[PDB]
From a paper:
Heterotrimeric (αβγ) laminins are a major constituent of all basement membranes. A major function of laminins is to form cell-associated polymers, which provide structural support as well as platforms for signalling. The three short arms of the laminin heterotrimer are composed of long repeats of laminin-type epidermal growth factor-like (LE) domains, capped by laminin N-terminal (LN) domains that mediate the self-interaction of laminins. The LE repeats are interrupted once (β and γ chains) or twice (α chains) by globular domains of unknown function.
The β2 LE5-LF-LE6 structure was solved by the multiple isomorphous replacement method and refined to Rfree = 0.210 at 1.85 Å resolution. The asymmetric unit of the monoclinic crystals contains two structurally very similar copies of β2 LE5-LF-LE6 (r.m.s. deviation of 0.62 Å for 301 Cα atoms). The β2 LE5-LF-LE6 fragment has a surprisingly compact structure with approximate dimensions of 60 Å × 50 Å × 40 Å. The 220 residues inserted between LE5 and LE6 are folded into two distinct regions, a 10-stranded β-sandwich (residues 564–726) and an α-helical region (727–783). The Ca2 + ion is coordinated by the side chains of Glu573 (monodentate), Glu575 (bidentate) and Asp719 (monodentate), as well as the carbonyl oxygen atoms of residues 598, 601 and 719; the resulting coordination geometry is a pentagonal bipyramid. A search for related structures using PDBeFold revealed that the β-sandwich of the LF domain is related to the family 35 carbohydrate binding module (CBM35) structure, despite pairwise sequence identities of just over 10%; the α-helical region of the LF domain has no counterpart in CBM35 or any other protein. An unexpected feature of the laminin β2 LE5-LF-LE6 structure is the relative arrangement of LE5 and LE6, which closely resembles the canonical arrangement of LE domains that are not separated by an inserted domain.
Residue numbers in the entry: 523 to 704, 714 to 833
Write the structure that this text describes.
Amino acid sequence: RPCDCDVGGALDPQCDEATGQCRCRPHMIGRRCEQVQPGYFRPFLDHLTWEAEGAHGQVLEVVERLVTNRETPSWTGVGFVRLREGQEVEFLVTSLPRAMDYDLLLRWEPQVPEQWAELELVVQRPGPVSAHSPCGHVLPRDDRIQGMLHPNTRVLVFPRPVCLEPGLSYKLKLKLTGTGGRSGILIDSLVLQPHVLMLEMFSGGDAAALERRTTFERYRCHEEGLMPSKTPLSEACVPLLISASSLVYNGALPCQCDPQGSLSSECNPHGGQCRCKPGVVGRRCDACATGYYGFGPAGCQA
Ligand SMILES: [Ca+2]
Ligand SMILES: [Cl-]
């Protein structure tokens, strides 16, 4: 009997008529709006990734890396950028899904043993934050954040999140002020991970919210976002990420598989990977693998 619509996938908490159908956000389906529509996907917590090697600004050395039969690369894009003391990388960030806090993850790889580094991140906005926006509380101190890279890691979560808004273009500047050990550092990318625990499905006061919050933290579901590799999560994480993603993105996103590079318009509904032709890479199968050429109907060749 009970409605029990999806807290994330449906608009109202109760069903209509005697069909038991809920009102769904865009491209969520099922009687309770609990399923992603074929042709659409729920994004991974690290969907919003900007490659260091795609960055504008001062000329920096690109360090390419080849995929080996080992599979499971530890980087994305062609590889990395080598950043030395005093140099800066500019990430041009646009098209964010929602006005909320994002945690900043810097993915990197050291060049000497026991390597540490000191960094400064500055958020540059296209105007003053408005009093009526969810980011209206932001002040200048909130938009400059220091971070330290520690030995034996490949990702840093900066110690404070940033509040960013949809429909706007930002420039996030990353400066390396010092690095040593006992040729600089390699930077892979910057990831903007939505801080989904602030959503009411978790942060609310009701018993149902407290349970979701407890489960999310116990199984550390937020770790999906840390690295390119995706190791299977506890099954308990799955419906929580489906619901949280629907609330961030307003339902599910269209796959947008590249017509030439993909075998199909239909991508994986968890994370959105398209099925690539030989020699093709990228979520949308829209680039040649490194060392391959000739993007077209057949794929790419070495
Ligand atoms: Ca990269
Ligand atoms: Cl993408």
